[PDB]
Amino acid sequence: SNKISATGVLVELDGDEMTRVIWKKIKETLIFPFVNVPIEYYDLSMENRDKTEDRVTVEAAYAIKKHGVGVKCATITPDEARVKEFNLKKMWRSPNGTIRTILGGTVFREPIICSNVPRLVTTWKKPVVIGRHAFGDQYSATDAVVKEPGTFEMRFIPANGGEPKVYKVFDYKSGGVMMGMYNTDDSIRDFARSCFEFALARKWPLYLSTKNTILKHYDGRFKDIFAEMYKALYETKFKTCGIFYEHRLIDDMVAHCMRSEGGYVWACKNYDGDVQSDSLAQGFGSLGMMTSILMTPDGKTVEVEAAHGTVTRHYRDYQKGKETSTNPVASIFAWTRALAHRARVDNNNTLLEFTQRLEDVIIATIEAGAMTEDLAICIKGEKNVVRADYLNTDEFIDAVSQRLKVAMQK
Amino acid sequence: SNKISATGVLVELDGDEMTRVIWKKIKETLIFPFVNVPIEYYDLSMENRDKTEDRVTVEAAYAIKKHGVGVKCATITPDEARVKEFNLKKMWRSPNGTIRTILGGTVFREPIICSNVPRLVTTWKKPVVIGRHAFGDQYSATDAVVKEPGTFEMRFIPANGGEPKVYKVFDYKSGGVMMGMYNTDDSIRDFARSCFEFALARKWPLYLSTKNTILKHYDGRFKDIFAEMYKALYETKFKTCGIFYEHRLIDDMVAHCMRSEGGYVWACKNYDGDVQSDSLAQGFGSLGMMTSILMTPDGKTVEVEAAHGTVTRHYRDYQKGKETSTNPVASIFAWTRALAHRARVDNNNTLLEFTQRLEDVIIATIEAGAMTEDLAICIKGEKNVVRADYLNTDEFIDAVSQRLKVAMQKS
Numbered sequence A: 001s002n003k004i005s006a007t008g009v010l011v012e013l014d015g016d017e018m019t020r021v022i023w024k025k026i027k028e029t030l031i032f033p034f035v036n037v038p039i040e041y042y043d044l045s046m047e048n049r050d051k052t053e054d055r056v057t058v059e060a061a062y063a064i065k066k067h068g069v070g071v072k073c074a075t076i077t078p079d080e081a082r083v084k085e086f087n088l089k090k091m092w093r094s095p096n097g098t099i100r101t102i103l104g105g106t107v108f109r110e111p112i113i114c115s116n117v118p119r120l121v122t123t124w125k126k127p128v129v130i131g132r133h134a135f136g137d138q139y140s141a142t143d144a145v146v147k148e149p150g151t152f153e154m155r156f157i158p159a160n161g162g163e164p165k166v167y168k169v170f171d172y173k174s175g176g177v178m179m180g181m182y183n184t185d186d187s188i189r190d191f192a193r194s195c196f197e198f199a200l201a202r203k204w205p206l207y208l209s210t211k212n213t214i215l216k217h218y219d220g221r222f223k224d225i226f227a228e229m230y231k232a233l234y235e236t237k238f239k240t241c242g243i244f245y246e247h248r249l250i251d252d253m254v255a256h257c258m259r260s261e262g263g264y265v266w267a268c269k270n271y272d273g274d275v276q277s278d279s280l281a282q283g284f285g286s287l288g289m290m291t292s293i294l295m296t297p298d299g300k301t302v303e304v305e306a307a308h309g310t311v312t313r314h315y316r317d318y319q320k321g322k323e324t325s326t327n328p329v330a331s332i333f334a335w336t337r338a339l340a341h342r343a344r345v346d347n348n349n350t351l352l353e354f355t356q357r358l359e360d361v362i363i364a365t366i367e368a369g370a371m372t373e374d375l376a377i378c379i380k381g382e383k384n385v386v387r388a389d390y391l392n393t394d395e396f397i398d399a400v401s402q403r404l405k406v407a408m409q410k
Numbered sequence B: 001s002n003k004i005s006a007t008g009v010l011v012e013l014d015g016d017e018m019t020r021v022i023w024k025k026i027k028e029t030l031i032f033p034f035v036n037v038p039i040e041y042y043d044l045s046m047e048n049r050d051k052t053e054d055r056v057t058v059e060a061a062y063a064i065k066k067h068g069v070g071v072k073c074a075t076i077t078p079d080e081a082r083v084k085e086f087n088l089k090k091m092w093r094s095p096n097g098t099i100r101t102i103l104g105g106t107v108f109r110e111p112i113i114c115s116n117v118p119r120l121v122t123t124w125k126k127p128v129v130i131g132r133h134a135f136g137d138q139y140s141a142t143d144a145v146v147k148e149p150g151t152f153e154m155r156f157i158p159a160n161g162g163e164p165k166v167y168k169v170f171d172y173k174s175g176g177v178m179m180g181m182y183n184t185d186d187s188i189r190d191f192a193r194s195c196f197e198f199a200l201a202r203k204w205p206l207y208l209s210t211k212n213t214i215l216k217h218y219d220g221r222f223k224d225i226f227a228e229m230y231k232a233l234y235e236t237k238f239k240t241c242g243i244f245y246e247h248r249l250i251d252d253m254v255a256h257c258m259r260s261e262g263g264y265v266w267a268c269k270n271y272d273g274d275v276q277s278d279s280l281a282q283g284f285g286s287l288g289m290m291t292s293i294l295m296t297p298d299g300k301t302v303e304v305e306a307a308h309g310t311v312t313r314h315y316r317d318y319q320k321g322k323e324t325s326t327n328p329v330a331s332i333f334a335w336t337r338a339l340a341h342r343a344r345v346d347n348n349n350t351l352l353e354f355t356q357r358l359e360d361v362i363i364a365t366i367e368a369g370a371m372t373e374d375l376a377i378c379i380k381g382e383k384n385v386v387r388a389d390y391l392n393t394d395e396f397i398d399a400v401s402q403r404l405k406v407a408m409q410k411s
């Protein structure tokens, strides 16, 4: 019972509403008792984001680049109703957006799985981790209606005074609609770097979906760039790891995902990752059972968080004194994942040990049958759920806490 | 009570490989012995499309437009390999894309369910019917890699002689990639008309996914057009059946599809409908249990078929001379679906009842354990099925024929 320490620092980003109440508890019960982390702490509450005029958000991001690891609690992103609620003198940009620009990199969503908790998709046994390429295809396109008959044309004008090449796209007769989109080789090459680095670190294979049958050039450039890089830099390493990479056609990927056991990383384009991430996440079940995690292209800088929001509907009931059974595992797993990275970077196996315990002690505690209300509802259905079927949030943490001590051997 | 018939006509398209052999028995066994509806027959064997330069294809399209109701056996879509196998001439176009263009409107995939055959998604208790647009967008789009540094711009050049309209799209420094797509107001309008008609006729409610969050002008146009057309011609008729039209984003809709019981028509754009139809394909179980049906904008003209292809691999065992358990139920349902549409235009409640019992009989056939391999692998899983769990194709069709004549008697 020597409490574990570290050698580098861990950047903590505190947040809002219900997840903050949960954050605080976790640190008191599942982290600070068992381990001493140096923590550079930025408070990203809405209150304190407003007070520093967002400066702490940016400060937090740069710290993550200096130090190399960050955990983030759910933070409210301000909108119109929020500016009236919290009296903000500015509608500040979503802190994730701010953070993500500065760090750069790609977001991987990895769900936590338990035996007894069933999935919507019977086949699924292991994580399917979708990486999403955020730099714009349709998200930075330029769209327009066509009210007159006429002709939609595309010019590529070379900057070295060279001859423009132009493209007949369509001659409309009645009305219509037109669009143009783009992407960079550098944005793609960074998307690729992230993916290869994540899947390698995780010791999973990597898939890539495109529709390159139809868009032989546009979607072709993705397939190629991944290929260029793979057999250059990654193929030997993956092959030592017992993993691989293949490009699949998007039509096969959805079918493969449907039919498959799982246990792989799925890298897909901006639009595809956006559409798929929601069905996929639904299918695995509770949003408390999944974590986000941005990974820069080098693979040394990581920001990690639960893939749910500040779960406000519950933060009301907590204010009103009512019992609440918000699921804390995604939050808890943000800590363990993030601390793991820290350990893997500093080559620190007492800390890397701890993270393995907690991760699996959580799965044990639910696998045995102690679970928050949402998981009960997967097993037992939404009618049928009685109070003895779920622990509330606080008594679940106290339940993983004892079970952790049990497995503090070594 | 002997054999019955109807005054309107079916339009039979003969197809090729395994599905052509199943086709031959389906008729002789399950439908012709109990139903004698007139048939303007058109053979569409890959054989014959070489022998008439893809021109029986087009003839058949216009045959259906003229007559109102087609049924189609699967056909080969010429690969570069199929050229060497059959004959040179031209590496032809797809007879599906050929007949679909000629007739206009939209294709709706509808799965068939059996209580004892599980889905991969533990909530799908009712069918989910994707209608894919199948025109424009990324499927007729121009694309280019960008090797130099330069500007990508878009010009709209009016036909009348007016001012071009230019759009600065991007300025490349390194290398990049570019693209442009169109869709037309009259393709979305006919996409819309068909869906509203189809959702109505089948008494299911109608969703439409877009991305008008992102693509305000482009996707909005779709949103606005269904909104226009719903109010002005369908919103009344929908409420007089107890159904609704709603738009959702594509994110909610795929979250919906996954968590929802089913029993709706989901109009998808050309790219969403290609992708999503494949997730639904696998999720329901077997392509043996799904029919593609093509409805024109007016909704008075249909060409129905099976969602699967010719089942080449099975046909290869048929040539070795070996046993095969190819699932005919989609092909049979393709008949009972056309004939049903033939009946509701003749007001023929006799033929309408035959189609419903035949379908009821194939369902209870499978619910009492009599089934083909694919459905055996759907229950027991790929590597745990043995010969004693499934019937071959002949045994199966014969098993339902026996079951059919008893249900004809007891009434």
Ligand SMILES: NC(=O)c1ccc[n+]([C@@H]2O[C@H](COP(=O)([O-])OP(=O)(O)OC[C@H]3O[C@@H](n4cnc5c(N)ncnc54)[C@H](OP(=O)(O)O)[C@@H]3O)[C@@H](O)[C@H]2O)c1
Binding pocket: A073, A074, A075, A076, A077, A078, A096, A287, A288, A305, A306, A307, A308, A309, A310, A311, A312, A313, A314, A325, A326, A327, A328, A374
């Ligand atoms: N990481 C981030 O920064 C991030 C991301 C997204 C949203 N948000 C913020 O969160 C706020 C609320 O957004 P929201 O309520 O739409 O999204 P949400 O927090 O994901 O809540 C949606 C609903 O999902 C259920 N849920 C989510 N997490 C859960 C958990 N851990 N345990 C049990 N149930 C859970 C709850 O349903 P019931 O009502 O049935 O209990 C909840 O009301 C917003 O102000 C937004 O800015 C932050």
Ligand SMILES: NC(=O)c1ccc[n+]([C@@H]2O[C@H](COP(=O)([O-])OP(=O)(O)OC[C@H]3O[C@@H](n4cnc5c(N)ncnc54)[C@H](OP(=O)(O)O)[C@@H]3O)[C@@H](O)[C@H]2O)c1
Binding pocket: B073, B074, B075, B076, B077, B078, B096, B287, B288, B305, B306, B307, B308, B309, B310, B311, B312, B313, B314, B325, B326, B327, B328, B374
């Ligand atoms: N006109 C059309 O309706 C249409 C549509 C799509 C494709 N096609 C054409 O069909 C040809 C063959 O393509 P394909 O083999 O990839 O697709 P397919 O004919 O749909 O067969 C795909 C595979 O899925 C399984 N399967 C499909 N239908 C089945 C059934 N009724 N019963 C049992 N198993 C079934 C079989 O796998 P196992 O052998 O593993 O059991 C089969 O080999 C191509 O030339 C293609 O162009 C035609």
Ligand SMILES: [Ca+2]
Binding pocket: A273, A274, A275, A277, A278, B251
């Ligand atoms: Ca999304």
Ligand SMILES: [Ca+2]
Binding pocket: A251, B274, B275, B278
């Ligand atoms: Ca497809």
